[PDB]
Design an enzyme around this catalytic site. Structure first.
Site, short mmCIF file in Angstrom:
data_model
loop_
_atom_site.label_atom_id
_atom_site.label_comp_id
_atom_site.label_asym_id
_atom_site.label_seq_id
_atom_site.Cartn_x
_atom_site.Cartn_y
_atom_site.Cartn_z
N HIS A 16 0.83 -1.26 -0.08
CA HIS A 16 0.07 -0.13 -0.03
C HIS A 16 0.79 1.20 0.06
O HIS A 16 0.44 2.24 -0.25
CB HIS A 16 -0.98 -0.05 1.39
CG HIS A 16 -2.07 -0.93 1.06
ND1 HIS A 16 -3.36 -0.69 1.13
CD2 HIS A 16 -2.00 -2.22 1.03
CE1 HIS A 16 -4.06 -1.73 0.67
NE2 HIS A 16 -3.24 -2.71 0.87
N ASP B 229 3.71 9.49 -0.43
CA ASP B 229 2.78 8.69 -0.35
C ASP B 229 2.51 7.74 -1.30
O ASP B 229 2.30 8.02 -2.58
CB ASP B 229 1.63 9.79 -0.25
CG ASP B 229 0.36 9.24 0.60
OD1 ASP B 229 -0.24 8.27 0.46
OD2 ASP B 229 0.00 10.27 1.39
O1 LIG Z 1 -9.77 11.96 10.89
C1 LIG Z 1 -9.55 11.40 10.10
C2 LIG Z 1 -8.58 11.42 9.10
C3 LIG Z 1 -8.35 10.36 8.07
N1 LIG Z 1 -9.45 9.82 7.63
C4 LIG Z 1 -9.54 8.82 6.60
O2 LIG Z 1 -8.35 7.84 6.68
C5 LIG Z 1 -8.14 7.68 5.39
C6 LIG Z 1 -6.76 8.29 5.14
O3 LIG Z 1 -6.04 7.52 3.92
P1 LIG Z 1 -5.09 8.08 2.99
O4 LIG Z 1 -4.85 6.99 2.09
O5 LIG Z 1 -5.08 9.66 2.64
O6 LIG Z 1 -3.64 8.26 3.91
P2 LIG Z 1 -3.17 7.12 4.90
O7 LIG Z 1 -3.45 7.33 6.23
O8 LIG Z 1 -3.38 5.74 4.46
O9 LIG Z 1 -1.71 7.30 4.82
C7 LIG Z 1 -9.00 8.30 4.43
O10 LIG Z 1 -10.15 7.54 4.30
C8 LIG Z 1 -9.33 9.38 5.28
O11 LIG Z 1 -10.80 9.80 4.93
C9 LIG Z 1 -10.57 9.54 8.65
O12 LIG Z 1 -11.46 8.75 8.49
N2 LIG Z 1 -10.61 10.44 9.85
O1 LIG Z 2 -2.62 0.88 11.20
P1 LIG Z 2 -1.84 1.95 11.57
O2 LIG Z 2 -0.67 1.53 11.82
O3 LIG Z 2 -2.57 2.96 12.47
O4 LIG Z 2 -1.80 2.84 10.28
C1 LIG Z 2 -2.94 2.95 9.34
C2 LIG Z 2 -2.94 2.42 8.02
O5 LIG Z 2 -1.72 3.49 7.49
C3 LIG Z 2 -1.39 3.10 5.99
O6 LIG Z 2 -2.41 3.23 5.25
C4 LIG Z 2 -0.81 1.85 6.10
O7 LIG Z 2 -0.82 1.64 4.65
C5 LIG Z 2 -1.82 0.75 6.90
O8 LIG Z 2 -1.02 -0.49 6.58
C6 LIG Z 2 -2.00 1.05 8.09
O9 LIG Z 2 -2.90 0.03 8.44
#
Ligand SMILES: O=c1ccn([C@@H]2O[C@H](COP(=O)(O)OP(=O)(O)O)[C@@H](O)[C@H]2O)c(=O)[nH]1
Ligand SMILES: O=P(O)(O)OC[C@H]1O[C@H](O)[C@H](O)[C@@H](O)[C@@H]1O
Ligand SMILES: O=c1ccn([C@@H]2O[C@H](COP(=O)(O)OP(=O)(O)O)[C@@H](O)[C@H]2O)c(=O)[nH]1
Ligand SMILES: O=c1ccn([C@@H]2O[C@H](COP(=O)(O)OP(=O)(O)O)[C@@H](O)[C@H]2O)c(=O)[nH]1
Ligand SMILES: O=c1ccn([C@@H]2O[C@H](COP(=O)(O)OP(=O)(O)O)[C@@H](O)[C@H]2O)c(=O)[nH]1
Ligand SMILES: O=P(O)(O)OC[C@H]1O[C@H](O)[C@H](O)[C@@H](O)[C@@H]1O
Ligand SMILES: O=P(O)(O)OC[C@H]1O[C@H](O)[C@H](O)[C@@H](O)[C@@H]1O
Ligand SMILES: O=P(O)(O)OC[C@H]1O[C@H](O)[C@H](O)[C@@H](O)[C@@H]1O
Lengths: 456, 455, 455, 456
Positions: free
Chosen positions: C154, C360
């Site tokens: 991912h 990212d």
């Molecule tokens: O307060 C928050 C902040 C983030 N998100 C969600 O978490 C995911 C963030 O995923 P993204 O791929 O942008 O970043 P990642 O956290 O995986 O690196 C998206 O659905 C956002 O809408 C959420 O639900 N609540």
């Molecule tokens: O699961 P956490 O460690 O809180 O991070 C939230 C998520 O962030 C990114 O999307 C990673 O690709 C995921 O593997 C992880 O599950």
């Protein structure tokens, strides 16, 4: 005929006014072999509108300029030291790009080209050095200079995924293709540049290492920079200063691990301190019987990132000694001081282990100096990071990954207990590689390759 | 008849399980002279509901309790170590007052009084020690204990302008007046307490004998001391083989030596700065002197203690990095605990003892340094004017640590001081500490206590 | 037939117990389209020897395990979060490699494979997700599982010059080749993996179909997506009453809005600096614009995460301190988690979405912002060229976050962009994300997997 | 006859070039009432050998000098700001004593006395202000000036246990006794000075506040510095700037807690932020319905301790808002900006609660300005640290100990819900105290006391 060398840093003719750094050591080595003109920064600021200062010493002529406070700041401290140096060392998190720094960087390259112009002859073979001067050929071409101009990069050229993060990577690449010859420290540096170039524009390569981009012709090649093995032999065998003649006698049953470099985050000094701590933790038999000395003069002390690494290093020295020291034994000697290069050659000779583990380094002359300085009949051991350009040739060193402190500790332990016969054969292999690839060889190959191209 | 001593910290009967700190050294000294019962914290947490642990060794009996994690945290780490210690050491900037810590502080004083109660006899003369136990007499009084109870404060008592910043100074002062006798390390500490009291309520003093809120109590000064005969003995014992070597090798190097808990009250960074100034302004000493600082971690869970430690590690690395040579480390910083026996010997072989706390109730290290010296060839004591010891070690080189150059100059004077002026300084300091024995301390206090009539 | 998905993080069946993170959002999206078994960590520690917890909701079955404190620490906090995450995001300076973390990482992968084994059928198609589980196929192979196993990464896969710094890159590469299918977010990630592989061993590629060490495997690119129809629904639902107010009050204020885990990969400080440059160089926007940053704490036990958070707090205070007015706060920083449902609505009422990560894998926030916009009056997406999403959201304002003035200029362009140019930019982006559905992602990956013959 | 006032800081005749600080506000107030000559630092560095700059505006004459970079540094930034200021505010941990700073401090006092000398007449009544000028009378005496010289200390005088830590407390005390009259802000300050003096030498006191030390005669007295209640009434009732006229309308159901001061560690801003956090934590009913605005212009920003406190404050603002903010509600408005005093009077008037909780403060005029500016028919509440000199007279404020954040939170809660009747009576009591003790009264009492002593 006449060779004109340009770099930001110069080695002064007063030779013990020298500042740490491999470029100036390299170029002086080269010039002493060739003959020529060295144009570069005096190291001083203020009085920028004064005439060039010129000194002649044998077959070398120096012409230096001063820089204004603002130029030094924008071109040297900001763009060169807080954008290019961190980016080319894969430290995008440390890059500090701002438009005024870029403008100043261009402004000084142009200024320096104006100042060099009256010194040039039609004849001249022009050799520009290092990341301060990427735009320099382009500035010379717009002033009508048609001479052969070669460039040599003393530091790594980073892969596209890093290089393209530079806001201005764009212009940098265009301008590098105004050189006739681009020289790199390792094949990977060369390939990385060619990669970055190909991502931007079509590059035709119809022959080994001969290219076209945007209709500009240019050549690329690899010249790992070296050292004068014969001269360091001589200096390493000269008598020690009285106070060190003492310490050698006193430390007769203590083994010495020794490191020396500019206090730069590229050099991985905190990780090194951590590897020494792991040595002391996991190999208690060495307590009181070994000593690690780190010499690390301040470099570029106005750049925030350099201040931070220095403070971090002071903390680790205090911590490690605080924890493993005894009333009569300091495990770690950290010296934030500059030492004369003459003297360092002697210290190398009397060290049992040279510890050279930069996180990233274009070449690393300290590694080669360490080998050249050893007494062939009783040589120390080189422990070398796989990320130093020198690891491509010092293949018989104990090669390690500095991100694994325990692998570095184990190599220190292996180095400390290595038999004379293994030390002889590892040393003689390394020495031969650096003798064959002399600073005189470097200089010869580059100039010969440059003289071989037809100018526009 | 029977003496009952209570303190948070105790000196264990297994004597080399000892932790740095002057209180336990003092009280053990006292108890060894007196006889008695020592009730206090075992130093361990968990199993708090287990019976008191009891060990008898000669004329001393130990009874210890464990504390829960929460009590240790609220009473010890927070209130005692992050409110009272910093405030009494004039570091209001470091106080970390929160109501739950205050409640926990009261809660454990109450708990400890419940635990002590069944051990007590009508007879007992009760002697409570140090800032952990300010409320303790009050707790004993509400449980009906009418015995003579004395208190001794091992640390400074700060002036009103500082003390009154304590949100709870109020209750502290009321509760101190439930002691029959309050003992202090210096006249200034006593006067400071009396001042604080006077600001809050009317205090009648018809004789060091007082009334506040209709409660009668006495105040007095008893500067804590050392066993000069015993340290003489231990200082003259053979050195460990490794150190016997170092002494031989350092024959033309002079040693400046310091030892203390790594505490911000001790002014270690300022000390390092004074040493730097010595190195800067007296280059003649380069390669020929050595400053060794021993500083075991103390109270390492309190943020302010972590901070000072990091700052000290930075300064060691910086100073050595700047003045060190390939064969000369100017400064030996050891973050390690050393056995007290061994320290006495190290003192004996040090040319200068550097004791310059920013603020200190007494400072036994200063007295130990003088007691250890070979009378025929003694080193020099450089002493902060802010250490309680400066009231009596009047012949030390007295300095103000806030002036690094004054401290450097005293180090230089100490390093070049003739034998005669070393002999006469030392023989005056030694006499003062011999006359004011730990045995004298203990005797004067107990005698004064035994002299008051209980309620 | 049956699809078995494994990831460390899962989306719980109680859906508002959700934690920020794109993986869980993606996989749930996928599973909802497919049907299947989701095996992963419950998110809790302790009770690790209890049976798997199983819940069935429609066509999805969840099977979760707890982890011990030590396993969570070594495998999750240390190796996954303080070695692999920083390295794959080109932050070697942040890598914290130690052998016990590596051992713990192996140990938990092995343990998880033991726990999964009894649930598997011959039939199954197994889909493993993300950097926590690089060794997992290898573990399944040594337990005799011959099933098709695909992996999807991912996050970015870094170039050799970075990847090879991992002390253990070696083993990681070997073990990845035990997967039948390796899926990546962008062509560059796939090429970088293949490069790393080629540096270590000879790789034959006779067709995205490879051989290394005699192991056959396939590589492919599947950029992860969103459910555009569902967000359109949730974006158009009524606002909570409090926010219904704010929207009325902010009628003549334009909103720049950003939301992500508080992660150093996201470039939040550089973003704040770009906003500062906007405020510096475009004074006409003072009092008329607002930048809101939502940034829930993520992985708050890892030092590097604490550092970035403290730095962010400092910049919020500094910027507001310098450009705020009595009735205008330029920057609203909220260190809080917001429900996804609600975020969709906010996106719909934002004039500009600011999404400028330093690095990212994809960035779903960018896609959600476009999917949420009212097609008749859409906001503008400002997007870092380093987000995987930039390969497809080609009509966003693409910027380089390392150039704060380029980012400020794009914010200014975004704030003054005419309706027509917002319509055509948005529609182009929306079409891309509608064609590359989460459903499409899931379909392509399963179909590719089902197409290979197992060993 | 003629009054000569000297202070380091002056209020410029161009009045909106004013810098935050109570001294200049006070003295201008005084001089406007008296008439006279104001001699002091222009606030600029460089050109130190230029003639005094002189401007006359009504009954006031200004004579200013520039200081060299070195003098500014040693006398102002080091000794005055990094020794005396922290020490007199019970922050020995922050004192940064070095001998060169002490020497510079003496050097500039001497220099300033040379510069003042030619301006003086036999007549003159000389009034020296504040901790920058402790040695000044001594310097004037050795130049033969026999005039009445009074001193007024605008900041606390610390108890012996603190004062005696000053390496140089010694000389300071000797030299203070060269003044004929020493004025302090509170009885405690006066007593503290007398204490320090008594510890060093025998002081005879044969009358109410009349002393002898080392054969030098001098008087001590208390004059709490005040404000012009009539003038702030006028400026507080003037129309609001259009932008703020808006905000007042919009914040109709939000209550405002307001603070203003130089960003100084003496002011306890972090502790204040913590008290505000405790209010938000323990009184959730106030969420979305209150606002705390902190105005804190940078002061003395070259001094390390000032940089530190500022960074700390920025962190706390970010943290607290991060934690308690909502999409449409910022709990805390921190502004690192200077506001015109005219405007502040209005912003006080419209504030429900004035939060003034310094850790240590000579007087604190903001507290008095806050009361003077309230609408008597509907006044806000003053929450006041017991450690501010103002607490001796503003006895009807909600007096609190800032080291107890929950006591401060509780007082904020009481202030936010106090009935009109209580607010009236608390305000009228405070207003009367500050009306009776006018800046005009201060000035009158001091001058009258000075005029009453016979010169040497
Ligand atoms: O307060 C928050 C902040 C983030 N998100 C969600 O978490 C995911 C963030 O995923 P993204 O791929 O942008 O970043 P990642 O956290 O995986 O690196 C998206 O659905 C956002 O809408 C959420 O639900 N609540
Ligand atoms: O699961 P956490 O460690 O809180 O991070 C939230 C998520 O962030 C990114 O999307 C990673 O690709 C995921 O593997 C992880 O599950
Ligand atoms: O105190 C010092 C430290 C370094 N060097 C010299 O500086 C050069 C360092 O070059 P190197 O390639 O190792 O590293 P660089 O500074 O160029 O990164 C070597 O010739 C060293 O001997 C020196 O002369 N004195
Ligand atoms: O590493 C150490 C440090 C100190 N101490 C003993 O700890 C006491 C220090 O007490 P002092 O009054 O000097 O200071 P305190 O530690 O109680 O504040 C002295 O007896 C020391 O000899 C020790 O035994 N080993
Ligand atoms: O932004 C500001 C804040 C402060 N003040 C004024 O500066 C003086 C500060 O004096 P105070 O005694 O309250 O603190 P000081 O600097 O004197 O120690 C008061 O008149 C404030 O109204 C000002 O002019 N602008
Ligand atoms: O020249 P300085 O910035 O002091 O750095 C010293 C030298 O460091 C490296 O060797 C660089 O490659 C040179 O360009 C540089 O001169
Ligand atoms: O017991 P600790 O908190 O480790 O501190 C060690 C000792 O330090 C000082 O000497 C205190 O006065 C003692 O009460 C304390 O016992
Ligand atoms: O002038 P600064 O050093 O910035 O400080 C501002 C002013 O306010 C304070 O109250 C001092 O007592 C004054 O002497 C000072 O001049």
């Amino acid at each position: 005929s006449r060779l004109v060398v340009v770099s930001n840093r110069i080695a002064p003719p007063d030779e013990h006014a020298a500042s740490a750094g491999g470029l100036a050591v390299g170029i002086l080595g080269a010039l002493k072999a060739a003959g020529g003109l060295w144009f570069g920064w005096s190291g001083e600021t203020g009085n920028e509108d004064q005439p060039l200062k010129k000194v002649k010493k044998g077959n070398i002529t120096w012409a230096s300029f001063n820089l204004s406070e603002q130029d030094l700041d924008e071109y040297y401290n900001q763009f060169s030291n807080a954008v290019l140096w961190p980016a080319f060392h894969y430290r995008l998190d440390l890059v500090q790009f701002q438009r005024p720094a870029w403008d100043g960087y261009l402004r000084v390259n142009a200024l320096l080209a104006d100042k060099l112009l009256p010194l040039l002859q039609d004849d001249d073979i022009i050799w520009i050095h290092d990341y301060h001067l990427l735009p320099f050929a382009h500035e010379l071409r717009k002033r009508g200079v048609n001479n052969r101009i070669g460039f040599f990069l003393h530091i790594p050229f980073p892969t596209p995924e890093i290089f393209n993060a530079l806001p201005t990577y764009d212009t940098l690449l265009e301008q590098l293709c105004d050189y006739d010859l681009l020289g790199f420290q390792t094949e990977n540096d060369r390939l990385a540049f060619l990669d970055c170039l190909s991502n931007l524009t079509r590059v035709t390569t119809r022959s080994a290492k001969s290219h076209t981009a945007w209709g500009k012709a240019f050549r690329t090649e690899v010249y790992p920079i070296g050292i004068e093995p014969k001269e360091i032999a001589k200096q390493a065998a000269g008598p020690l200063p009285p106070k060190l003649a003492q310490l050698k006698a006193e430390l007769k049953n203590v083994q010495n691990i020794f490191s020396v470099e500019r206090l730069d985050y590229s050099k991985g000094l905190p990780e090194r301190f951590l590897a020494y701590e792991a040595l002391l933790e996991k190999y208690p038999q060495h307590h009181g019987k070994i000593r690690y000395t780190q010499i690390a003069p301040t470099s570029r002390g106005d750049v925030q990132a350099y201040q931070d690494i220095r403070h971090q290093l002071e903390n680790e020295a205090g911590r490690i000694n605080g924890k493993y020291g005894q009333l009569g034994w300091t495990p770690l000697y950290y010296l934030n001081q500059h030492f004369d290069r003459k003297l360092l050659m002697k210290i190398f000779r009397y060290s049992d282990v040279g510890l050279v583990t930069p996180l990233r380094d274009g070449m690393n002359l300290v590694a080669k100096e360490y080998v050249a300085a050893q007494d062939p009949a009783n040589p120390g051991v080189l422990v070398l990071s796989q990320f130093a350009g020198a690891a491509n040739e010092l293949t018989s060193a104990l090669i390690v990954n500095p991100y694994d402190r325990d692998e570095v500790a184990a190599a220190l332990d292996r180095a400390l207990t290595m038999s004379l016969a293994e030390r002889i054969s590892r040393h003689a292999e390394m020495l031969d590689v650096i003798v064959k690839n002399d600073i005189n060889h470097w200089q010869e190959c580059f100039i010969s390759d440059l003289k071989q191209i037809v100018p526009r």
